[PDB]
């Protein structure tokens, strides 16, 4: 028997809003700024530390460039494949998308950190030596496009 009357917030979900400079009983005459000063009037810049050159100013820059033409992939773990494929078999980009391991559009790569014990046929783009050896030892195949 709950009406619109019987609606209550969670305990502690509501914290009281502080009214600053609303009487000397709680917060008075200074509003949490204390005594006189520029912090008592407006503010201080974040990058300003008293006139001396800041830590973002007396430090060298990092060398080298960012390589705007970088090609990006996403690793898929052999152990994760083994866990998600107890039965095993052929695996492809659509299958991995359905399994939700990588983004649908993104391009995939695999590595052999985990262990494989189920025959899995892997279709991918870039293969590493460890994943290749794991696939070969698990009695399966893995072809790269």
């Amino acid at each position: 028997v709950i009406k619109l009357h019987d609606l209550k917030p969670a305990p502690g979900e509501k914290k009281a809003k502080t009214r600053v400079g609303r009487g000397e009983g709680s917060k008075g005459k200074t509003a949490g700024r204390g005594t006189k000063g520029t912090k008592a009037r407006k503010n201080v810049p974040v990058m300003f530390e008293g006139g001396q050159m800041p830590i973002h100013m007396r430090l060298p820059k990092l060398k080298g460039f960012k390589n705007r033409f970088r090609t990006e992939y996403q690793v898929v773990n052999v152990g994760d494949i083994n866990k998600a494929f107890p039965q095993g078999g052929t695996v492809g980009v659509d299958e991995l998308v359905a399994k939700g391991l990588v983004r649908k559009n993104s391009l995939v790569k695999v590595l052999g950190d985990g262990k494989l014990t189920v025959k899995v046929d892997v279709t991918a783009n870039k293969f590493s030596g460890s994943a290749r050896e794991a696939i070969t030892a698990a009695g399966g195949s893995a072809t790269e496009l």
Partner: peptide, 10 residues
Amino acid sequence: THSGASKRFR
């Protein structure tokens, strides 16, 4: 963001 810091920090 502070462009000076980013070119210097990671």
